[PDB]
Amino acid sequence: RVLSGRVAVVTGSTSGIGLGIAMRLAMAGADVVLNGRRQSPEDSAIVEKVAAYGTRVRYFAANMKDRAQVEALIKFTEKELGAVEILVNNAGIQHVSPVETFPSDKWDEIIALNLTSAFHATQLCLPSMRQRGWGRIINIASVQGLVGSMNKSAYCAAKHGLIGFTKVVALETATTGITCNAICPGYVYTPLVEEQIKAVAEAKYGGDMEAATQAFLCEKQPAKAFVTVEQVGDAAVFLASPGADMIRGTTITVDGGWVAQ
Amino acid sequence: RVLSGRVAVVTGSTSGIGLGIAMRLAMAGADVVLNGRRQSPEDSAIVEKVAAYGTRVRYFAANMKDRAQVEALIKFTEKELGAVEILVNNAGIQHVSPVETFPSDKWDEIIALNLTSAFHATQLCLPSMRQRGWGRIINIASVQGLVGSMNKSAYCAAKHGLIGFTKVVALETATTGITCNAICPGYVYTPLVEEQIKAVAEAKYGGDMEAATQAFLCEKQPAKAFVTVEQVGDAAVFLASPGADMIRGTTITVDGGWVAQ
Amino acid sequence: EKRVLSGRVAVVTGSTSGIGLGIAMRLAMAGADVVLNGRRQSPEDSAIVEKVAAYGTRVRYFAANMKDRAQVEALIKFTEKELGAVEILVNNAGIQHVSPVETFPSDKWDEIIALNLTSAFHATQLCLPSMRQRGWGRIINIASVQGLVGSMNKSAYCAAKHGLIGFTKVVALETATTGITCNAICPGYVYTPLVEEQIKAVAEAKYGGDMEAATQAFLCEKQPAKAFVTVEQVGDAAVFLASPGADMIRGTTITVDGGWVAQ
Amino acid sequence: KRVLSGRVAVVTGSTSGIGLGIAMRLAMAGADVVLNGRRQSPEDSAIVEKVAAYGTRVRYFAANMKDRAQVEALIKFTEKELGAVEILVNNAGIQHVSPVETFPSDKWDEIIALNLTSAFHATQLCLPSMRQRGWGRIINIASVQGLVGSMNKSAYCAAKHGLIGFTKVVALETATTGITCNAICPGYVYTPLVEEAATQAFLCEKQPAKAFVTVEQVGDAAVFLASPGADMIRGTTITVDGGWVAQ
Numbered sequence A, B: 001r002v003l004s005g006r007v008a009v010v011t012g013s014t015s016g017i018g019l020g021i022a023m024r025l026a027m028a029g030a031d032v033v034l035n036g037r038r039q040s041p042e043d044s045a046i047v048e049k050v051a052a053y054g055t056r057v058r059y060f061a062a063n064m065k066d067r068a069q070v071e072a073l074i075k076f077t078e079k080e081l082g083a084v085e086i087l088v089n090n091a092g093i094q095h096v097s098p099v100e101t102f103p104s105d106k107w108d109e110i111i112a113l114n115l116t117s118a119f120h121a122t123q124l125c126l127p128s129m130r131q132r133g134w135g136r137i138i139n140i141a142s143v144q145g146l147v148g149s150m151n152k153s154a155y156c157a158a159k160h161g162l163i164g165f166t167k168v169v170a171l172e173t174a175t176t177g178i179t180c181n182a183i184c185p186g187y188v189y190t191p192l193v194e195e196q197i198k199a200v201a202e203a204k205y206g207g208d209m210e211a212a213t214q215a216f217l218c219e220k221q222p223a224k225a226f227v228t229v230e231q232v233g234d235a236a237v238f239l240a241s242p243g244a245d246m247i248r249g250t251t252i253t254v255d256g257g258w259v260a261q
Numbered sequence C: 001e002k003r004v005l006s007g008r009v010a011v012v013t014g015s016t017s018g019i020g021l022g023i024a025m026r027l028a029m030a031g032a033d034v035v036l037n038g039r040r041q042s043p044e045d046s047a048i049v050e051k052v053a054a055y056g057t058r059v060r061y062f063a064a065n066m067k068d069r070a071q072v073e074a075l076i077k078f079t080e081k082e083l084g085a086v087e088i089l090v091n092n093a094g095i096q097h098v099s100p101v102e103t104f105p106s107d108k109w110d111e112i113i114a115l116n117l118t119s120a121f122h123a124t125q126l127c128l129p130s131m132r133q134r135g136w137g138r139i140i141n142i143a144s145v146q147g148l149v150g151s152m153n154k155s156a157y158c159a160a161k162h163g164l165i166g167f168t169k170v171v172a173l174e175t176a177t178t179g180i181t182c183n184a185i186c187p188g189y190v191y192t193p194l195v196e197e198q199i200k201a202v203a204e205a206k207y208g209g210d211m212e213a214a215t216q217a218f219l220c221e222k223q224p225a226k227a228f229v230t231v232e233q234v235g236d237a238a239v240f241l242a243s244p245g246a247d248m249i250r251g252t253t254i255t256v257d258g259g260w261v262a263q
Numbered sequence D: 001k002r003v004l005s006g007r008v009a010v011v012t013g014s015t016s017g018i019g020l021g022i023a024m025r026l027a028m029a030g031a032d033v034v035l036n037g038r039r040q041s042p043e044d045s046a047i048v049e050k051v052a053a054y055g056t057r058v059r060y061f062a063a064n065m066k067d068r069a070q071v072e073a074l075i076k077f078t079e080k081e082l083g084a085v086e087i088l089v090n091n092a093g094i095q096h097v098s099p100v101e102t103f104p105s106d107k108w109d110e111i112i113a114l115n116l117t118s119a120f121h122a123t124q125l126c127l128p129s130m131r132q133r134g135w136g137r138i139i140n141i142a143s144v145q146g147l148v149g150s151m152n153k154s155a156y157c158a159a160k161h162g163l164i165g166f167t168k169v170v171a172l173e174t175a176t177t178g179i180t181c182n183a184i185c186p187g188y189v190y191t192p193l194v195e196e197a198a199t200q201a202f203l204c205e206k207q208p209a210k211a212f213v214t215v216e217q218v219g220d221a222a223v224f225l226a227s228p229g230a231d232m233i234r235g236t237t238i239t240v241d242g243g244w245v246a247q
């Protein structure tokens, strides 16, 4: 297994894409630390699901908007499993609103979680990676980091900024065994997206989720199909593998053709 | 002249690129409101420089990191000159540091001024532009919004984010007479850049500003010459003119070839 | 009174109609002398010349097939003899052919590559030595949004326009320390006979021959502004790139597309 | 037992360098592979045996990718020997370094023909069967030079940019199917086409990693694009460049 022995931390990995990434990393042999904002009654089941692949799996609740809790997550991983070798910055939120009425607090929260938390986690993990001469920082961006979409100003700004950050980290580590790269998914059927589909279904299609899902998807995604959490996880495993030793500062876009048009 | 009668606000226009933009907009016929962080002894001389072109000029001190002062700047313009028709989001700061030691407060400040302030000013100006059926929002990004550079993680993240924000605003206004675009300068010999070059000269070139300047340009800018504040202003005039009525959500890169390679 | 491009000699390939004519008009309005060009001599040439010349500059016409390097050279030499050294070169002659990849005709693929990409290389190669000798030049390549993104059934055109943008970058880098710049303009949909024919095909296929609905559907698929870009706007972009404020704009794209590439 | 087991791959221009590395990695992942070069050569048995060390079916076919009839012959040979072409890797590419002013016209034409138009012909010939079978991979070997420019490489940058544009269109025209089309963009790789202090000098200007990309890494990117996890990777670039395009 290509990642056997490596210690990975996936932020926001209690559901959706984050859980899919953690699952795929474990299948590839990595020990994994799962993380959610607050402790959930589903945490034990999630940890056992990931542990089914025979690696060491832990859970640590931490609000990634709080730098002290980011540090606590890293220290917990170092105590339980060892030095963080793979860092996946995934935790992120969405808020759909036109620019004129976009709430200031929601803008600030999206910037804080989708961009600044990745900076804090990366800052905390890089010293050990440099000392060991190996590391992977994998930032879960979006197609919205490469193009714009209406009513997603804060999210598009934060994801564009996360891609910029990725480039700089990669350039500062380019002569080391540390790489930094971003994965840019298109639409994946998570709760983050199911809520948006609900909103459009109520507003436009009489609550019909089949019709609304197709209209939502086909607006943006030429494949007329969702990307899966399994595919995003496969991209993360690829970036963490030796074949990606010279992939630095780039985007792996998994989007059904969204950015190609 | 092409912008005769239009009222423009340029944030951070007491120095460098912002002042060059204000001067080129005034040369093109616009009335202009200047802005700096705080009142300075040189303010009246800067007003005189911009007023040399025969238009109406005002000055308002306001900290763009404070949303209430942004609002005060807009209301001042409305009282003195009229509705804000051209908004140039320019005020910006830089801090050079590797990611591992990048100070948290400096990261936050760069995000706040170079990205979030533009969101606040745009939000405050859009309703009047929509009511009147015309507007220009011109965001001063950077080459660092399109590619990364070592030791500039916060600034690259902020400038990338500002370009993403530009796309979204443009898309939300695409069917109106309002456009939103970004200008992406390469190196311009302003105090923001002079300070970086002086730091490099003292740290690595024995105080030789000629050698430090050569090395600074040669690293990144194929033209081996600076872009000028007048050229950035000329790009702003172009975006504000009628020939740009259908230029929306794009970047005008004025960089001596930086991004082409 | 003198104008911003007064004294400069421009050549615009494929400038007897549409975008090329709009560019020629705007350059002449900005004070440039202009050589117009079409594939072959036509009865309309005189009227087009006089229309451009109404702005008080020197205007000429030369018929040349831009697929034939000998005729490209003849166009440049004609300009040198009639008006003087070519200082602004606008590579605009291009063609379109809509087809799925599986059935795309080989000859049409070759023709689109030849006109939309290789002709610009030939003209640029022929004009650069004089520009370098004089220390000043503008090469302005008329690309497309299709040089930055793909669209279905336009494989050859998207390939050629992407290639033209790559070529633009290299020319700009090889001239970056000189007074010569090279850049590309990337229009979205402009109401020209090329787009008109595409819309006619769409109308006869999907909307039963309704031109209003066909036009609206054609625009809204790709162009968020739900309005066409105009030939005048493309010309304004060319004038901007040719002007002194663009002395340090090198190897880049000016995208005039109603938001097409922003989403 | 392997992710590409049973898949039939054709790699154009695969007798050495990057193309051979791709063939080796595809076979390592279980693919049957047809190798290709311009002319029949000694060492062709050697390269076939090298790739066949991975335990799959390996063939060789000589064909000049500038000749549409020979491209068709390559595809038909593959269909006869192994079955339908399922993975097509377009890697017939050549280079010529020259300033624009003196760039030979025939060299410009040849670079466009091999680096761009040959990929169109091969893709056109392979797509109908892929559509019928419900699955395909078209993997175009582009370059960093398809995303940025470099001095003295006008024809190559134009052709590689064009190949990326072509990739987007093919992907969009197949987006609702089991066929994907994508491009791999390598930075400097230590091949004859490219080639201690001299090495660092050549790498320093463009490649921040100050090290070469390997042929095995380019092959690993092709295996990734051919795998099920890439079913919804469409019309994009996988850039393997040591940071070149990030700055």
Ligand SMILES: NC(=O)C1=CN([C@@H]2O[C@H](COP(=O)(O)OP(=O)(O)OC[C@H]3O[C@@H](n4cnc5c(N)ncnc54)[C@H](O)[C@@H]3O)[C@@H](O)[C@H]2O)C=CC1
Binding pocket: A011, A012, A013, A014, A015, A016, A017, A018, A035, A036, A037, A038, A062, A063, A064, A065, A090, A091, A092, A093, A113, A140, A141, A142, A143, A184, A185, A186, A187, A188, A189, A190, A191, A192, A193
């Ligand atoms: N779903 C999609 O279509 C796409 C999503 N993405 C990104 O993928 C990442 C995962 O999103 P999804 O799985 O769709 O959403 P989700 O709602 O299914 O998952 C959110 C996860 O983040 C955790 N989380 C939220 N706020 C947190 C905080 N402050 N601290 C710690 N953990 C926190 C939640 O507990 C949950 O584990 C997000 O960054 C999203 O922006 C990117 C592109 C496409």
Ligand SMILES: NC(=O)C1=CN([C@@H]2O[C@H](COP(=O)(O)OP(=O)(O)OC[C@H]3O[C@@H](n4cnc5c(N)ncnc54)[C@H](O)[C@@H]3O)[C@@H](O)[C@H]2O)C=CC1
Binding pocket: B011, B012, B013, B014, B015, B016, B017, B018, B035, B036, B037, B062, B063, B064, B065, B090, B091, B092, B093, B113, B114, B140, B141, B142, B143, B184, B185, B186, B187, B188, B189, B190, B191, B192, B193
């Ligand atoms: N100089 C360069 O090479 C490049 C600069 N830029 C951008 O151009 C913009 C202008 O920068 P420069 O002219 O080079 O710098 P500068 O230091 O000469 O000018 C900065 C202006 O911003 C004002 N400012 C700073 N903080 C402020 C605050 N909190 N509130 C209000 N005003 C404030 C300063 O008073 C000054 O007027 C910045 O956004 C910079 O990112 C972009 C690319 C290249």
Ligand SMILES: NC(=O)C1=CN([C@@H]2O[C@H](COP(=O)(O)OP(=O)(O)OC[C@H]3O[C@@H](n4cnc5c(N)ncnc54)[C@H](O)[C@@H]3O)[C@@H](O)[C@H]2O)C=CC1
Binding pocket: C013, C014, C015, C016, C017, C018, C019, C020, C037, C038, C039, C064, C065, C066, C067, C092, C093, C094, C095, C115, C142, C143, C144, C145, C186, C187, C188, C189, C190, C191, C192, C193, C194, C195
């Ligand atoms: N019309 C549009 O929506 C867009 C067009 N463009 C590009 O703008 C340029 C002009 O296109 P349009 O004005 O729209 O089309 P058009 O058909 O109106 O213009 C074609 C012009 O090129 C000339 N021409 C054609 N083949 C020639 C040849 N072999 N030798 C010499 N001259 C030749 C024709 O005489 C005519 O003057 C083309 O490069 C097109 O690719 C770019 C983006 C959008």
Ligand SMILES: NC(=O)C1=CN([C@@H]2O[C@H](COP(=O)(O)OP(=O)(O)OC[C@H]3O[C@@H](n4cnc5c(N)ncnc54)[C@H](O)[C@@H]3O)[C@@H](O)[C@H]2O)C=CC1
Binding pocket: D012, D013, D014, D015, D016, D017, D018, D019, D036, D037, D038, D063, D064, D065, D066, D091, D092, D093, D094, D114, D141, D142, D143, D144, D185, D186, D187, D188, D189, D190, D191, D192, D193, D194
């Ligand atoms: N070498 C590098 O640094 C980079 C190379 N590439 C691309 O990778 C591809 C392979 O290049 P390299 O391995 O570096 O070069 P190479 O010279 O080692 O490989 C050339 C291969 O193509 C074959 N070939 C050449 N012309 C042919 C034709 N007309 N028909 C059939 N086969 C033909 C040759 O027999 C040889 O097998 C080329 O497209 C190159 O542009 C991409 C980016 C970086």
